Design a protein around this ligand. Structure first.
Ligand code: EXP
Ligand code: EXP
Ligand code: EXP
Lengths: 158, 158, 160, 160, 158, 160
């Protein structure tokens, strides 16, 4: 059984994140969608809310397990018995910072292989930050989020 | 009559912004210089101050109208009857984020065409953030700002 | 204002990406000249006469587009055509550094010509005539990226 | 899952950077095909037969690697080989824009083939077969970047 | 005597910074390692702590002088009689912002030449921010910092 | 310290961008060798003898510049010249990825040679000898980008 971890802040999980985790499940036997607490980023949704949103958004994917964590990512991956670390790559700006993280994760856990997947063109220009910015100004974001997440974002900003 | 909108935080408006809006007025019949409230950015100048500075800095340009807004940019553009959205492109770092915004604005208002203009080499390495950082340390920024803006920045930091 | 814009390139062959850009340009400016470079440094797959006929047929539905061939420096042609706008398509995979060099050089050559960068649909943001030709030459399906007349001409060209 | 992956390229010659990537791929997937392009647009320094023999010797220690030559479009070969994973090495100096074009085009051609990007060690993150050949041709020491069999073959090739 | 300044926040100084300053001392007669107060960045270590850490980490380098400053960088360089400004370049993301700073410093002091040096591959993917993020999660950062700095970071987070 | 620096390139032809960089290098280092590559992979517009004479005339006012031709690997020449500094000009439009590859490879070849990157004036930050030649060949005005002797030589070269 090959175990992969897909870590991130997921504040909130978007269709771009769903695209990446779906590609991951077609490649690996078990995928852990791992939500980092990320207090330095001052998230809109609590960790508990982010976990609940992601569980509902991924319930159709049989081999996805949603787990929250506050640990060092590499220690959490070792403790999940993961040997693959999934990250999505949209453009050049992502690439540079992704290299730094991956080289640091390799120093902390050499057997954890970072693998980058590319989202559909449909989600190549979106991010959680961009969707929240549009939604704060009452712009329509239904196209970019799972139905349960869209409802939760509308309710959070109401 | 072709109507273009040039939106931004303009905290404060610089010679780089003046260069872009001047190029815009040579191309389109009416240009709306639209100043976003931008509370998430914690601006140095209030919206009212930014509007007053931009009005004075653009008074020599007959077809420029300066307006403040707190709305979703795309809704403000529809409400101004604008069909062109002007953005300045200085370098690669701008380009990536500009694509995300433009693809989102296209999703929100498909008839609003984003057009990117390139500033003079003279202003290709400056930004409102950089000018404020130099000015906070009492460095000379007279070369980068309209006279009224330079006075206001000196007075604000005095 | 009665603006004249130029949209230059090799168009070897014209793709759906080029059609997207020129369509956007026609919604913005009164007259758009789709200008096809006669003698590119790299021998084109299609001759200048073939490239012009394909672009004409593919843009026939756009009333304010004029397809013309040119052999001089793009700024010299723009000046002679009384164009004040230079259309550049900016894909998600474009060499932005080259675009900056080109635009500053074009501004030195003709200051009255303003470079305007337009963004294609996400659908065409990751293609190029170069990539399309390479794939088609290597027996790959490129129908999705081309106007029907171009697809027919490319199959005929690759059959010989 | 019994995954089959393809790792395509010119491998002219195979470097320690390529060995690093293919080694990482073998730790992730059940079967890895190191696929060597037969007729690249630019005449290779080593013939296809030389490139295959060097890659075979350099990967002989990896039990789940199969070295094979191919002459079709990389997606057409992947489809015929029943591969569902496409390995791409991402160096700190790679043309990420080109990688995005390639991956979106490969997804159009074969949607069931997933592009996976692997990162080489920092040690090989700033090299390429191109840079290595250019240095070696100009009398520079490249021993550090190549498997021993490749170093011996390159010295013999440059001596003639 | 050629005098160079190597300015930065150095919060804290890393092996990457040591690599750059060592290369600088092999090229120029006297190198001033200049630590900016940087209040806008909300540093982990006080200026006094950053100066003490850098002094101890560079004591083996005979021609390095460690000095703290709150002034405009260019005025501090003029006041140190420096004619060279050293900056490290790791990747593309650094390059763009470095150009803006260097063109501004050239406007403020034309005789101060900005020179960029490239660190070893070993330190090409690290930063003070990344090392602090790993250390906040109790990850091992001994490989990336001088011994005195590692101790101080462990003690600060204890 | 009595530092010797090398500033290598094709200089085909030397531009105001190159003059800006070498001038900055002379204000920093005791001796600057402007090193002209003899046999570039792409046949140069000007011969090595023409490139040397033009660079000599254009730098005659700088007392600590020595113009010399070289045909070996740039690190092999730097070593033989006892240079410890390698000058690289970094334009706003330079391939930074290539510069990183080059500098890490040069450090592997000669660890005692330190690569130093200098920034040209904003005025020359968007040009290249390549762009200048292409424009001049296509009947464009490039006088602003070149020393007067180079402008005269380029007009004579293009007239034939
Ligand atoms: C500032 C420049 N102006 C230029 N005009 C032309 N004309 C010939 C041409 C060839 C291929 C495509 C196109 Br479109 C135009 N080339 N050229 C340059 O390379 C730089
Ligand atoms: C989407 C594409 N698929 C492609 N398959 C091939 N096969 C020939 C080939 C030549 C050199 C290296 C490699 Br690896 C493969 N080329 N090619 C493209 O250029 C774009
Ligand atoms: C690490 C490298 N060192 C290299 N030295 C030379 N010498 C020949 C040369 C040709 C054109 C311009 C220049 Br400048 C030097 N080439 N070369 C490389 O391509 C990579």
């Amino acid at each position: 059984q090959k175990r992969a971890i897909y870590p991130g802040t997921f504040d909130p999980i978007t269709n771009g994140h769903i695209d990446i985790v779906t590609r991951a499940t077609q490649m690996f036997d078990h995928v852990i969608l791992a939500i980092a607490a990320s207090p330095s980023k001052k998230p809109m949704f609590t960790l508990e809310e982010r976990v609940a949103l992601a569980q509902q958004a991924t319930a159709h994917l049989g081999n996805v397990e949603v787990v929250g964590f506050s640990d060092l990512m590499a220690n959490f991956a070792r403790n999940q018995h993961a040997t693959v670390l999934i990250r999505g790559l949209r453009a050049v700006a992502d690439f540079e910072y992704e290299m730094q993280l991956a080289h640091m994760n390799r120093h902390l856990m050499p057997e954890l292989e970072s693998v980058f997947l590319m989202p559909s063109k449909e989600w190549s220009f979106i991010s959680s930050s961009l969707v929240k910015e549009v939604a704060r100004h009452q712009g329509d974001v239904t196209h970019f989020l799972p139905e349960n997440v869209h409802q939760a974002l509308m309710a959070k900003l109401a």
